[PDB]
């Protein structure tokens, strides 16, 4: 997930990235390429929460986009579906 | 050439070579620095904006070249004090720029040339962050210096 290589020619494949850098504020970039699949088969998040069995999945969630990956769909999706 | 985009490119690739007889070149067509065309239309980003913005190693050779073509023009006051004219970085000029980057000798070089110490960058994007801004600063150079851990430049002004 932390991914960013400095050699250049690998660097079509790297997942972190660096948008902006105005003094205190930096402005990182992660790839959602397999994290959040649309129209695809099966996604990393879904084994996060429906195959995966290991005890160490609370920390597993608790790395870097996920904890705001999540917290984008609860936005857009639970008060509307709460509402319902 | 003598057209817009390809001088807007060489200004980033930092190549004073590459910008040699411009100067009677606006000399022939009349045309000043800031006139209509040699800055942005959506937002005002002008040419020696874009210098301050890619750097080589915080050095580009243009930044006093881009102040002596447009001194010979009678500018001084107007191409380094032109802000943005847009609304989400609305009010940001290059000496908002020149602090951001911490290039202190780019800093003494615009304001002994003729820079205005008050400008405001009001823009929609330096309101705090219930505002709907990233980053809040009081709109001032003065503050701004500050904010960005440089005393020197604090010195300076």
């Given at each position: 997930?932390?991914?960013?290589?400095?050699?250049?020619?690998?660097?079509?494949?790297?997942?972190?990235?660096?948008?902006?850098?105005?003094?205190?504020?930096?402005?990182?970039?992660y790839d959602?390429?397999?994290?959040?699949?649309?129209?695809?088969?099966?996604?990393?998040?879904?084994?996060?929460?429906?195959?995966?069995?290991?005890?160490?999945?609370?920390?597993?969630?608790?790395?870097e986009p996920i904890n705001e990956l999540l917290r984008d769909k609860w936005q857009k999706f639970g008060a509307v579906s709460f509402y319902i | 050439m003598f057209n817009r985009h390809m001088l807007f490119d060489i200004v980033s690739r930092g190549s004073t070579a590459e910008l040699e007889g411009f100067l009677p070149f606006l000399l022939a067509q009349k045309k000043r620095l800031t006139d209509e065309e040699f800055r942005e239309a959506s937002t005002g980003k002008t040419c020696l904006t874009k210098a301050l913005m890619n750097?080589?190693?915080?050095?580009?050779?243009t930044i006093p070249m881009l102040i002596d073509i447009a001194e010979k023009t009678g500018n001084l006051r107007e191409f380094i004090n032109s802000p943005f004219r847009d609304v989400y970085y609305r009010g940001q000029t290059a000496l908002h720029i020149a602090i951001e980057r911490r290039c202190k000798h780019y800093v003494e070089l615009l304001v002994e040339k003729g820079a205005d110490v008050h400008a405001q960058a009001r823009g929609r994007f330096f309101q705090?962050?219930?505002e709907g801004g990233y980053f809040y600063f009081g709109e001032l150079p003065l503050s701004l210096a500050a904010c960005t851990n440089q005393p020197d430049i604090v010195h300076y002004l």
């Open positions: 997930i932390r991914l960013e290589i400095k050699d250049e020619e690998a660097r079509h494949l790297s997942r972190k990235f660096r948008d902006w850098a105005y003094g205190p504020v930096y402005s990182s970039l959602l390429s397999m994290l959040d699949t649309c129209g695809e088969e099966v996604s990393v998040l879904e084994i996060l929460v429906y195959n995966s069995k290991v005890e160490n999945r609370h920390e597993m969630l608790a790395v | 750097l080589n190693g915080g050095k580009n050779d705090p962050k219930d």
